Amino acid sequence: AKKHYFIIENLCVGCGLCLDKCPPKVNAIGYKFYGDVQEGGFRCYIDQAACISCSACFSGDECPSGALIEVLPDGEVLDFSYTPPERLDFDLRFL
Amino acid sequence: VTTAHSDYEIVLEGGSSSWGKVKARAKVNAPPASPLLPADCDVKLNVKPLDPAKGFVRISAVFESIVDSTKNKLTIEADIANETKERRISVGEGMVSVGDFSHTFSFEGSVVNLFYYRSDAVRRNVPNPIYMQGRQFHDILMKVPLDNNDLIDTWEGTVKAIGSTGAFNDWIRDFWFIGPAFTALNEGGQRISRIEVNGLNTESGPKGPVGVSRWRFSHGGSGMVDSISRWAELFPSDKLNRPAQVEAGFRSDSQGIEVKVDGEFPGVSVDAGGGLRRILNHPLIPLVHHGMVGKFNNFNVDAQLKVVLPKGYKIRYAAPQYRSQNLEEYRWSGGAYARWVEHVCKGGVGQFEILYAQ
Amino acid sequence: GSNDVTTAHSDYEIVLEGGSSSWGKVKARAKVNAPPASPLLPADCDVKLNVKPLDPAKGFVRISAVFESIVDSTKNKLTIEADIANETKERRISVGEGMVSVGDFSHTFSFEGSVVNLFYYRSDAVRRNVPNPIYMQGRQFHDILMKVPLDNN
Amino acid sequence: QGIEVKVDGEFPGVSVDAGGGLRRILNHPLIPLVHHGMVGKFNNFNVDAQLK
Amino acid sequence: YQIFDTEKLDDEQVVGGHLALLGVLGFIMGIYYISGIQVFPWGAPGFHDNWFYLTIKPRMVSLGIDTYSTKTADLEAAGARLLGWAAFHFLVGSVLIFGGWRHWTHNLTNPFTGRCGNFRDFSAKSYKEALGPHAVYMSLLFLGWGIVMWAILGFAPIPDFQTINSETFMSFVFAVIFFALGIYWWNNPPNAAIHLNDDMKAAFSVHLTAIGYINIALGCIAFVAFQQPSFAPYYKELDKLVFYLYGEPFNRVSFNFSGAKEFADFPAYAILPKSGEAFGMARVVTNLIVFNHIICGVLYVFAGVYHGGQYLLKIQLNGMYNQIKSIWITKGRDQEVQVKILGTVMALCFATMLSVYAVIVWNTICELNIFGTNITMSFYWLKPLPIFQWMFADPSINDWVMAHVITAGSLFSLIALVRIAFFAHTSPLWDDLGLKKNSYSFPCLGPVYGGTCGVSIQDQLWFAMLWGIKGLSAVCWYIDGAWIASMMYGVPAADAKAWDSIAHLHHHYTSGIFYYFWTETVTIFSSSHLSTILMIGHLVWFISFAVWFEDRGSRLEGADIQTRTIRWLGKKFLNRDVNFRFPVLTISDSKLAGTFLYFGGTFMLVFLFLANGFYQTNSPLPPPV
Amino acid sequence: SGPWSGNAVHKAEKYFITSAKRDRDGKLQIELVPASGRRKLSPTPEMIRRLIDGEIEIYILTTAIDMNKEIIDMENRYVIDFDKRGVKWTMREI
Numbered sequence A: 001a002k003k004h005y006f007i008i009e010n011l012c013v014g015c016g017l018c019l020d021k022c023p024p025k026v027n028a029i030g031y032k033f034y035g036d037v038q039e040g041g042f043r044c045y046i047d048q049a050a051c052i053s054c055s056a057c058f059s060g061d062e063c064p065s066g067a068l069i070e071v072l073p074d075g076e077v078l079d080f081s082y083t084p085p086e087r088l089d090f091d092l093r094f095l
Numbered sequence B: 001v002t003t004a005h006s007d008y009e010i011v012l013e014g015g016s017s018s019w020g021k022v023k024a025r026a027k028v029n030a031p032p033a034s035p036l037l038p039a040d041c042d043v044k045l046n047v048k049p050l051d052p053a054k055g056f057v058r059i060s061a062v063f064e065s066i067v068d069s070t071k072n073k074l075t076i077e078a079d080i081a082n083e084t085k086e087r088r089i090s091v092g093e094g095m096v097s098v099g100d101f102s103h104t105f106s107f108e109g110s111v112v113n114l115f116y117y118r119s120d121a122v123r124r125n126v127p128n129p130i131y132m133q134g135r136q137f138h139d140i141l142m143k144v145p146l147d148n149n150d151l152i153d154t155w156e157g158t159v160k161a162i163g164s165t166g167a168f169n170d171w172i173r174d175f176w177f178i179g180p181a182f183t184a185l186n187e188g189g190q191r192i193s194r195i196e197v198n199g200l201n202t203e204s205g206p207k208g209p210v211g212v213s214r215w216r217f218s219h220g221g222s223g224m225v226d227s228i229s230r231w232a233e234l235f236p237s238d239k240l241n242r243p244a245q246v247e248a249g250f251r252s253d254s255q256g257i258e259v260k261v262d263g264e265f266p267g268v269s270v271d272a273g274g275g276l277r278r279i280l281n282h283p284l285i286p287l288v289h290h291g292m293v294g295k296f297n298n299f300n301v302d303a304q305l306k307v308v309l310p311k312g313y314k315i316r317y318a319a320p321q322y323r324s325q326n327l328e329e330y331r332w333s334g335g336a337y338a339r340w341v342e343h344v345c346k347g348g349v350g351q352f353e354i355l356y357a358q
Numbered sequence C: 001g002s003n004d005v006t007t008a009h010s011d012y013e014i015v016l017e018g019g020s021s022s023w024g025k026v027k028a029r030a031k032v033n034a035p036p037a038s039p040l041l042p043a044d045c046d047v048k049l050n051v052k053p054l055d056p057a058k059g060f061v062r063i064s065a066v067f068e069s070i071v072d073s074t075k076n077k078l079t080i081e082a083d084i085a086n087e088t089k090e091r092r093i094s095v096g097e098g099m100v101s102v103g104d105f106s107h108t109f110s111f112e113g114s115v116v117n118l119f120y121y122r123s124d125a126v127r128r129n130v131p132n133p134i135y136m137q138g139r140q141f142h143d144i145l146m147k148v149p150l151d152n153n
Numbered sequence D: 001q002g003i004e005v006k007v008d009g010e011f012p013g014v015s016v017d018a019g020g021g022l023r024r025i026l027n028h029p030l031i032p033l034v035h036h037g038m039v040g041k042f043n044n045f046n047v048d049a050q051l052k
Numbered sequence E: 001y002q003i004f005d006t007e008k009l010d011d012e013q014v015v016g017g018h019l020a021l022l023g024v025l026g027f028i029m030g031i032y033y034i035s036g037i038q039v040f041p042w043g044a045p046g047f048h049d050n051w052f053y054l055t056i057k058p059r060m061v062s063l064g065i066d067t068y069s070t071k072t073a074d075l076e077a078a079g080a081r082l083l084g085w086a087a088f089h090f091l092v093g094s095v096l097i098f099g100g101w102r103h104w105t106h107n108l109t110n111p112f113t114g115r116c117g118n119f120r121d122f123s124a125k126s127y128k129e130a131l132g133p134h135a136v137y138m139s140l141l142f143l144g145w146g147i148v149m150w151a152i153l154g155f156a157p158i159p160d161f162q163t164i165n166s167e168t169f170m171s172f173v174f175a176v177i178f179f180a181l182g183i184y185w186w187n188n189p190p191n192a193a194i195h196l197n198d199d200m201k202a203a204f205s206v207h208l209t210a211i212g213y214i215n216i217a218l219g220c221i222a223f224v225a226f227q228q229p230s231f232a233p234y235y236k237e238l239d240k241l242v243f244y245l246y247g248e249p250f251n252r253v254s255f256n257f258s259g260a261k262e263f264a265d266f267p268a269y270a271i272l273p274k275s276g277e278a279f280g281m282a283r284v285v286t287n288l289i290v291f292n293h294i295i296c297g298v299l300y301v302f303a304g305v306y307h308g309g310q311y312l313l314k315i316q317l318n319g320m321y322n323q324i325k326s327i328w329i330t331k332g333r334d335q336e337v338q339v340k341i342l343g344t345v346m347a348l349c350f351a352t353m354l355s356v357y358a359v360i361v362w363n364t365i366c367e368l369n370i371f372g373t374n375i376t377m378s379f380y381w382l383k384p385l386p387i388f389q390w391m392f393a394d395p396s397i398n399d400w401v402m403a404h405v406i407t408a409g410s411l412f413s414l415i416a417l418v419r420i421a422f423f424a425h426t427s428p429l430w431d432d433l434g435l436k437k438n439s440y441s442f443p444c445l446g447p448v449y450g451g452t453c454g455v456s457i458q459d460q461l462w463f464a465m466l467w468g469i470k471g472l473s474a475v476c477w478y479i480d481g482a483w484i485a486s487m488m489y490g491v492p493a494a495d496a497k498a499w500d501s502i503a504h505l506h507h508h509y510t511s512g513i514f515y516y517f518w519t520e521t522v523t524i525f526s527s528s529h530l531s532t533i534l535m536i537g538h539l540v541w542f543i544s545f546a547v548w549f550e551d552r553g554s555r556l557e558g559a560d561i562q563t564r565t566i567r568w569l570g571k572k573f574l575n576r577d578v579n580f581r582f583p584v585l586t587i588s589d590s591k592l593a594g595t596f597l598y599f600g601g602t603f604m605l606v607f608l609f610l611a612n613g614f615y616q617t618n619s620p621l622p623p624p625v
Numbered sequence F: 001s002g003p004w005s006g007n008a009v010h011k012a013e014k015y016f017i018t019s020a021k022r023d024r025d026g027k028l029q030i031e032l033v034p035a036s037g038r039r040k041l042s043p044t045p046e047m048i049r050r051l052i053d054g055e056i057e058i059y060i061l062t063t064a065i066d067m068n069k070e071i072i073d074m075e076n077r078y079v080i081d082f083d084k085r086g087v088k089w090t091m092r093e094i
């Protein structure tokens, strides 16, 4: 359906937590090695011809690198299902 | 001590729907700021879709009260439609009865809402605008049958007052907002302009003469007024595909106040962007208006907000925190929620926001 | 038992100077556990006010002010910087400029202002019978000429 | 859930002559007091403070 | 194992569960009471001594319920009193469990009158309004205990701090102050405001960690108190008694059963009488009581910090972590104090244990005369300062190393606890890259950057427990008199039997750290019961390696291969009898299961060090010249 | 700023380009959408000045080839006007 999910290549670390939640009838998530898997050479990816937009991949809040995005149906791009409100800070000392 | 016992419930619907059920109970042991006691009231609001092609809906309202050994009743029933997104049309009728006196009326009204600006930067830099200044214009034509002696007396006195004095147009605002209401007008953020009378006529009718009056007035706001800043939210003509209701009742006395509210209607939850939805921003006029009676007795607070979501929806960024998750329900009690409840029961307008997704 | 606790912790300091001087240092800390009456939360703000003597012969001084705030995930900034002088003891002249930026939108401005303050009375009995007057009725008149460059749509 | 404040300042006009050789702290401004009074009545609170 | 997690329960179910648990406690205490019976008032030669009752016997003897004698009237009266108290405990426990039923199911209704009850008013809305009346509730418990002693057990309240009448006097003194403190908090609640919102995880974690230090305090208080002359009638009257335990070396029987067995004892397979004064029973019971509260106290501390992290992580995921005024949060919400605070604790931990470990090896080197050294070259002169020599009896070098091993052991575990407290969501390295922690239990992130194992806060809890073993075990050696000052002692190799005399020890410790194992197990091997515990403890412990090594994927290999053998073996040997497909624990379960086998296995064996005798002499061990 | 404000993954506020429509101007439709996705911004030289200093980063989302002035190496060196080179992410599913 709408709102595809689109794992980012350059940020992925290959932890594989994204791959767990995808239903076994849908093997939409896979691996790519192209090198030695100790300096980050087994990044995963999503197959768009099998994905059925479960949101199990995004709504689970598991990606630690922000590699899952879940682009919105019209044009919008997400990175995590909710973000804190970005305040700004200092130091205090009660005299 | 003066404990304040209150009980709240919201129930939502899934999908793209916006309907909701609302339930409320309340109790205080404080004397209401009414110079006549006791005072009781029931309110029925019903609305059904007249027809969706025109956008016309039919809305009814009934009020009964007993104010210090005096029965008062007000019935109104009308048809409303949005002719444009900033014009609204209404045709309705009703009656009012106090004690033994009673009389009917039929009105014919239009309302136009205008904002002072339309800058799109305000639309791309602020995700959740709150204050929005504007002005409303009301054009009313109402007919009342003159059958009682007192109706004829009021009519003749009004004609004489309108003819004789040159300051009727602005002094009418003194009689208009009786008692403390007038004061709220300044503080609640509103400004009522002088009315403009377009002619008082009398014409023969079915049983006798009928007084016809048509008049125009306007009122502006600095943003706190919901009827102006949220002109689009308060009349959800889209989601009214089935009848909706609001049904409340308070019952005051010399020693505390009783409240009881049911309701079911759309517009409870709105889109918040990025797939998340939210409970609608709390209206500000009721808060600041009730703040003018809620500062008379310091009180203890206990309450329980209980929100029920549909399948697969999760609350994220609830500020203040909730206390329990009974697998679909979320409950707020004590602590920061109690502090916020005490804050808003005195006129405070701090934001308690709930975002939910799926 | 009794009602809500909500302690309010605050800390104040004044430091003066001797002689005929009137200078002073002021320091303040404060904390409350109560929800602010802001229909948008959270909200943060910093303010810088600085002033230096432009030159004493004219009486002209230069004053700057910078505001940053984050209001519910929205950065707001306002800068103003101006020169002020007392032309009389009841007229004041100012020439300054600044800018305001919200989110991505931003624009500058330059103003040219005068202010006149008038009291409703000048009775000297009010000056010889009351040692510490408090209330004093009057009216201020502002005359402003501001120019803003039109560059955005 | 509460409010944080932090203020520094250094400027003239803090102390004024009061006649008879005595000086005083300037009379407290009234507009800030009455304006803040419109938000300070919402929660009853406990007070502790230093003035030094 | 998260069926009773806090975010799923409301407030009443906590009260119901607590009442039910109190009832269960009453049942088991009654069970202990009748486990300590000797004669059965009707006369039925009862039970033999077991470690559960021998732990509480001094308290009963102090209260005039049990006794230290073997006569006609004494045992008959003691059995009757114990039966009465056990029955009373059973009754009160049944009532309490019924009340637990009543509070668990939201059913506070009177059975006699058709009345109801609201948990809100009957009162308090938040937990700070509840602190107050609780102090009034506890003032009643102190008041009742003074009444129970005075009315039933005698012991009129008298301020004599050498006999038990002082305890009765104190319970009335405390009821005064807890009541007086109760009213003030009912009118002036205190304020750490954040504990009321998520009050069943935040406030719980603080209490659990606070209880942990309390348990350690009573652990140390008991050790000092029980060795005073005032406590002599109840603790080292144990020495001049004779004990019959279960698992004692029994009356052996030959194959002639004829069969010249044993000493002259009429029962065959009889339990031999064991003297309780050659066996250091007076200290053995004291060690058992003290160590139980110390290890439980430490464990509560680790749990309290761990659950604080579970809450602490949660408020950083929704967004409120930025949103606290409580100073208990702003003092560490900076990421430059955290490095300084963690830096200054990991360096002090470096400076301390390196100092003691240098001393321990140097003493060990000096005995064996390695590299041509004498014992005169050792630190046999590093006594504590004279202003600190009151807290020790016979101050010496053995006390100096102990006082620092505890510090070195404690701060070594504090590193993990701090890293739970601060780096629950982000660490300087994890924010150095672009990375998250999101689950407080995720095992790793993969082999990227060389490996990312055990970074979550649950793993940090495991290492605190594992590092805490060294600190906890150091207590077992010290309270059993083990000479932790050098790692060999009493060994007949070169100079170990010299410590005595060059240091004027004026006592005689059992052995060194290594030689601790060879000694002591002389008695462990003598008992068949203790011998089985030795074998079981070692079997459980090493199984931890099966789940603690980096092998979970390897075990996932064989499970697949196994499934096909039990699949191919039900094929042509027996007919179709097989559908079972082997499960392997996940990494998160592997560490949870591994830590319990490691921690559980090692401390079932520590029991043998304590519950096998004291064996500390007072002979200065003349020189081996 | 502090790790606990905004998102903990990023060192500053991240933006993405989502629209590239040609409206009589070629690339008026640069729609800077933040990571949280509640706004639709534009080049807006104020955004450019806060970009160039330390605080904004933008990315191009391989799902305006020359109109955004690709230069000449590694198939990507996207620059906006003259100053700063908006890095881009890749999502090649093949």
Ligand code: BCL
Binding pocket: B045, B046, B047, B059, B060, B061, B076, B078, B080, B088, B089, B090, B092, B108, B109, B110, B111, B138, B139, B140, B219, B227, B235, B244, B245, B246, B264, B265
């Ligand atoms: C209260 C703030 C403004 C105000 C704001 C509005 C708004 C907003 C509207 C009108 C509209 C009307 N107003 Mg006006 N109007 C005000 C003061 C007046 C006064 C007067 C003597 O003061 C008069 C005579 C009128 C007259 C009128 C009619 C011209 C017209 C239709 C009334 C209606 O349908 O009745 C029916 C009467 C009621 C239903 C009573 C209940 C009113 C309360 C506020 C409803 C609460 C809704 C509840 C929270 C949720 C209900 C949901 C249920 C499912 C239905 N207004 C004040 C100054 N007025 C309506 C219009 O546009 O007509 C074209 C319209 O939308």
Ligand code: BCL
Binding pocket: B096, B097, B098, B101, B102, B105, B142, B143, B144, B150, B151, B152, B153, B154, B155, B158, B172, B175, B176, B195, B197, B211, B212, B213, B215
């Ligand atoms: C929108 C308001 C409702 C209305 C609601 C009430 C209520 C409520 C009450 C009365 C009451 C009465 N009504 Mg009426 N009344 C209305 C229309 C009329 C008309 C008319 C020619 O239209 C007349 C002659 C009357 C006559 C009477 C008074 C003689 C009588 C008791 C005095 C009183 O306070 O009046 C109040 C007068 C009015 C609210 C407005 C009267 C309108 C005048 C005569 C004609 C319009 C003049 C001017 C252009 C409109 C100004 C705007 C209004 C000030 C808001 N009503 C309109 C339809 N009427 C009382 C009663 O029932 O038992 C004691 C009472 O409590």
Ligand code: BCL
Binding pocket: C049, C050, C051, C063, C064, C065, C080, C082, C084, C092, C093, C094, C096, C112, C113, C114, C115, C142, C143, C144, D010, D011
């Ligand atoms: C607030 C009450 C009155 C007000 C009272 C004054 C007073 C009094 C003065 C002006 C003056 C000015 N006002 Mg005016 N003015 C008001 C509303 C306005 C509005 C508006 C849209 O509402 C506008 C555009 C203006 C415009 C102006 C300019 C014509 C002029 C110079 C401003 C300045 O220097 O900027 C600089 C801006 C600031 C520094 C912001 C900080 C303002 C706060 C109040 C300063 C607090 C001082 C602090 C307590 C101590 C500071 C000490 C430090 C050591 C410096 N005023 C309100 C109605 N206005 C000044 C003048 O005379 O020009 C000839 C002047 O003396």
Ligand code: G2O
Binding pocket: E357, E358, E360, E361, E362, E364, E365, E370, E466, E467, E469, E470, E514
């Ligand atoms: C970080 C702080 C720790 C310690 C310091 C500590 C010391 C310690 N441990 Mg340990 N340990 C943990 C931590 C520490 N554990 C943790 C976290 C766990 C997991 C829970 C853990 C586990 C186990 C297990 C399973 C066993 C042990 C032992 C065990 C003991 C034997 C080591 C020894 O003899 O040192 C040798 C000691 C000497 C003084 C050397 C003598 C030689 C020559 C003369 C000369 C050698 C040259 C030179 C002196 C060498 C040292 C150089 C130095 C001075 C620069 C020893 C006392 C073993 C035994 O006691 O077995 C009987 C054992 O098998 N632990």
Ligand code: G2O
Binding pocket: E540, E542, E543, E544, E545, E546, E547, E549, E551, E554, E555, E556, E557, E558, E559
């Ligand atoms: C006594 C301790 C152990 C076993 C008993 C054993 C059994 C076993 N292990 Mg092991 N193991 C370690 C200890 C033991 N591993 C350690 C300390 C490490 C860390 C170095 C370790 C590591 C690996 C890796 C990496 C792999 C395995 C496997 C693998 C399987 C192979 C299948 C096999 O050989 O059939 C033959 C298997 C048997 C004959 C098992 C029958 C026993 C009888 C019932 C004795 C009773 C056991 C016990 C006393 C009762 C339990 C009571 C307790 C709960 C109170 C097979 C079940 C492999 C698989 O899982 O699949 C192939 C694999 O990859 N390991």
Ligand code: SF4
Binding pocket: A005, A021, A022, A023, A026, A028, A029, A046, A050, A051, A052, A053, A054, A055, A056, A057, A058
């Ligand atoms: S949205 Fe569903 S189908 Fe698509 S990758 Fe995620 S889990 Fe698989």
Ligand code: SF4
Binding pocket: A007, A008, A011, A012, A013, A014, A015, A016, A017, A018, A019, A044, A062, A063, A064, A065, A066, A067, A068
């Ligand atoms: S969870 Fe995130 S980092 Fe891990 S494989 Fe999936 S996309 Fe990559």
Ligand code: SF4
Binding pocket: E443, E444, E445, E446, E447, E451, E452, E453, E454, E550, E587
């Ligand atoms: S061996 Fe285990 S802990 Fe280490 S990186 Fe691999 S999966 Fe993670």
Ligand SMILES: [Ca+2]
Binding pocket: E480, E520, E608, E609, E610, E611, E612, E613, E614, E615
């Ligand atoms: Ca021993």
